[PDB]
């Protein structure tokens, strides 16, 4: 019925909200990976001084 159709739409909203949680988690993980590259670059800069030495 009409009320049953609204339940499916509301249930689909939960999947969309859950999908947004996965996207939000992935974005933060990518941000963490970006911070790892900066840490590696700083370590590479320190290793550059060792190479210069």
């Amino acid at each position: 019925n009409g009320i049953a159709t609204l339940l499916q739409a509301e249930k689909e909203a939960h999947e969309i909200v859950s999908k947004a949680r996965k996207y939000r988690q992935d974005k933060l993980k990518q941000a963490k990976t970006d911070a790892a590259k900066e840490i590696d670059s700083y370590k590479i800069q320190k290793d550059k001084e060792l190479k210069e030495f």
């Binding site: 049953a4 949680r21 939000r24």
Partner: peptide, 19 residues
């Protein structure tokens, strides 16, 4: 519909918690 809306609200709340 109310149960699905509650699940949708819980999923929306979980999305903020997950973020």
């Amino acid at each position: 519909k109310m149960q699905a809306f509650i699940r949708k609200e819980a999923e929306e709340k979980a999305k903020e918690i997950q973020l």
